[PDB]
Amino acid sequence: GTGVLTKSNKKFLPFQQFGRDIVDTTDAVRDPQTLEILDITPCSFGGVS
C-alpha cells in the first residue's frame, strides 16, 4: 500500500501482523524484522476547487 508510517501506541498480540478498523481497511502493521507496531495514515488528499 501507500501511506505514512508512524510509531504506534497500539498493543498487538504476538500472533497479529496487521490490524483493521470497523470498515475492514488496514491501519497498522508489524514490521517483520523488528516487530514494532506502526500505524498507517493515508497520505494527504482532497478535492481542489
Partner 1 sequence: AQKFNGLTVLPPLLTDEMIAQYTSALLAGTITSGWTFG
Cβ at position 26, least distance to partner 1 in Å: 9
Cell of residue 38, nine digits: 506502526
Tell me the CA distances in angstroms from 21 to 18, 26, 39, one per residue in order: 11, 7, 12
Report the residue number, 5 or 35, with the smaller CB distance to partner 1: 5
Q: Using only the alpha carbons of the chain, give its radius of gyration.
A: 13
User: Which residues inside 1-49 make contact with partner 1, applying CB under 8 A?
Assistant: 21, 23, 25, 27, 41-42, 45-47
Report the residue number, 28 or 30, with the smaller CB distance to partner 1: 28
Nearest by Cα to 1 from 41, 48, 49, 30:
41
Positions that interact with partner 1 (CB under 8 A): 21, 23, 25, 27, 41-42, 45-47
